[PDB]
Amino acid sequence: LDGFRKWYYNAAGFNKLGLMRDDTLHETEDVKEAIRRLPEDLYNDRMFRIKRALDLTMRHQILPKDQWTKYEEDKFYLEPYLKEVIRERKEREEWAKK
Template sequence: MALSLIPKRFMSSALQRICYNLSGFNKYGLWRDDLIDDTDQDVIEALTRIDEKTIDERNYRILRAVQLSIQKDVLPKDQWTKLENDKLYLTPVVKQVRKEREEREEWNKLY
């Protein structure tokens, strides 16, 4: 009964925030898209399509996370990535690349 009084929108955002913090990558200052496997051909193509500044920022976050991991340390809590600040910079580009590849494969199949 008490749970029915809590709006579903609040529950989903609260649950989302809890899961985000439990994942642990934010303690190293990483964003969600920093974790995408960059050995996939679609991701490699997507990385060539985004601007140089974004690539440099991504590389810095990854190197800082590796250094912290080696030191068995995490960032101070005020420097952790917050869910509100985490933006998907690579995912839309990867989706577009995959869509283009699938269209190209479909076209090649037909002709």
């Protein structure tokens, strides 16, 4: 399962643009709240990575293979911050339900 997940990570292809996994999340309301709660350095790296991926998609290029994002290396930075947004979101929802 670990090797097949690495193969699927190579087949997804966002590592060839230098992106992380959390860069590829669709910005819903909860995702934008989690992005707003990021520290300044992580937010700046995320915006630069997104801008570089957009430039590479503009020129129809990819990064060199040494510059790709290694599956093992990818960091799920937004995840911790996101869970909270969802948790808080649900708590609020439940309160209203009841």
